[PDB]
Amino acid sequence: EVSREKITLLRELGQGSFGMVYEGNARDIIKGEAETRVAVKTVNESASLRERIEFLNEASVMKGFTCHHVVRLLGVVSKGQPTLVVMELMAHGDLKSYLRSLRPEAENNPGRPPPTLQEMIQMAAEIADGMAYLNAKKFVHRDLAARNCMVAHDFTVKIGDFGMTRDIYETDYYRKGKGLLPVRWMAPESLKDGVFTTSSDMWSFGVVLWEITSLAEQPYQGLSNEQVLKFVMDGGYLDQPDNCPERVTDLMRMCWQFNPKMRPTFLEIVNLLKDDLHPSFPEVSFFHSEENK
Numbered sequence: 001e002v003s004r005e006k007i008t009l010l011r012e013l014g015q016g017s018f019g020m021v022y023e024g025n026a027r028d029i030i031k032g033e034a035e036t037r038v039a040v041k042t043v044n045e046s047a048s049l050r051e052r053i054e055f056l057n058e059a060s061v062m063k064g065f066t067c068h069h070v071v072r073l074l075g076v077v078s079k080g081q082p083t084l085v086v087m088e089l090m091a092h093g094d095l096k097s098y099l100r101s102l103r104p105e106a107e108n109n110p111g112r113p114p115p116t117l118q119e120m121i122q123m124a125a126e127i128a129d130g131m132a133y134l135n136a137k138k139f140v141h142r143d144l145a146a147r148n149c150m151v152a153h154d155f156t157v158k159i160g161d162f163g164m165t166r167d168i169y170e171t172d173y174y175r176k177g178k179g180l181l182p183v184r185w186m187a188p189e190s191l192k193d194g195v196f197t198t199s200s201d202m203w204s205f206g207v208v209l210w211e212i213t214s215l216a217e218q219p220y221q222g223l224s225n226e227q228v229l230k231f232v233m234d235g236g237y238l239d240q241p242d243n244c245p246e247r248v249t250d251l252m253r254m255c256w257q258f259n260p261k262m263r264p265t266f267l268e269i270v271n272l273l274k275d276d277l278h279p280s281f282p283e284v285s286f287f288h289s290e291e292n293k
């Protein structure tokens with residue numbers, strides 16, 4: 001809960017799911033910082049009752065999340081209108097857009113090579129650590145994908161959720177049968193039964209890794225949405241991208257076990273990668289913290 005005068009919207013970052021996301025300046029929201037650049041989530045004038053409820057619900061649920069590898073909620077301006085949901089600025093935006101920019105051909109190439117093996121390991125652990133935290137909170141993401149991971153100024157990757165209705169990744173969703181669903185990221189049991197669990201999140205994590213190593217190509221490229229449903233439910237999974245490191249490939253195969261109970265947990269992933277991460281990882285991670293029991 002934050003005073004309205006402590007927040008100033010500066011510019012549009014882009015359309016969120018039910019409203020515009022702004023970049024703003026926040027006064028005295030973090031201890032030791034007189035100012036902080038922030039992202040500010042708002043709700044459209046054309047948003048429905050159901051959507052406002054989801055918007056506010058998200059803010060409320062995120063009040064209980066504190067993790068270095070999950071996009072943080074800093075505060076809410078809720079007194080009067082409009083509701084401003086203030087969050088940490090992730091300067092480099094979503095991982096899909098970022099990965100696609102790293103393509104040699106890409107017109108918005110930021111002037112740096114594709115991700116190295118060590119950068120891939122670091123990303124993987126950070127994503128897995130954020131998910132491990134969320135799982136400890138009995139949260140199931142339901143839409144884990146590179147497009148929902150976010151990249152900070154220092155290139156730390158964190159779990160986010162833009163929702164499903166951004167125009168830029170429309171084709172990442174299919175209106176199966178009902179509601180929009182990220183079918184190319186979904187576990188076979190989720191496609192069949194409609195159930196989402198931490199284990200189906202793990203499946204999606206496998207797909208995120210595939211995205212990282214393929215610079216965010218479309219999963220099951222040569223298959224239509226209907227074909228993907230049938231392919232995955234019958235035991236199909238993705239092929240390995242070209243020049244994919246063996247270590248990352250091995251993780252993918254763990255994530256894509258048909259039986260969800262054969263898949264690893266997010267804590268197990270971090271445990272596999274822990275030794276090769278940045279020295280700061282133990283000082284910030286959920287995995288190494290007292291909270292992890």
Ligand SMILES: NCc1ccc(-c2cnc3[nH]cc(-c4cccc(NC(=O)Nc5ccccc5Oc5ccccc5)c4)c3c2)cc1
Pocket residue numbers: 013014016021039041057058059061062070071087088089090091092093094159160161162163
């Ligand atoms: N393409 C230009 C651009 C670049 C950056 C951003 C940007 C930058 N920094 C940001 N910080 C936070 C956001 C943002 C924007 C919209 C929605 C959200 N929401 C979440 O990420 N929430 C979330 C995080 C982790 C797990 C789940 C989450 O959602 C739910 C939580 C509880 C219940 C239901 C959902 C963040 C942003 C955009 C936007 C556009």
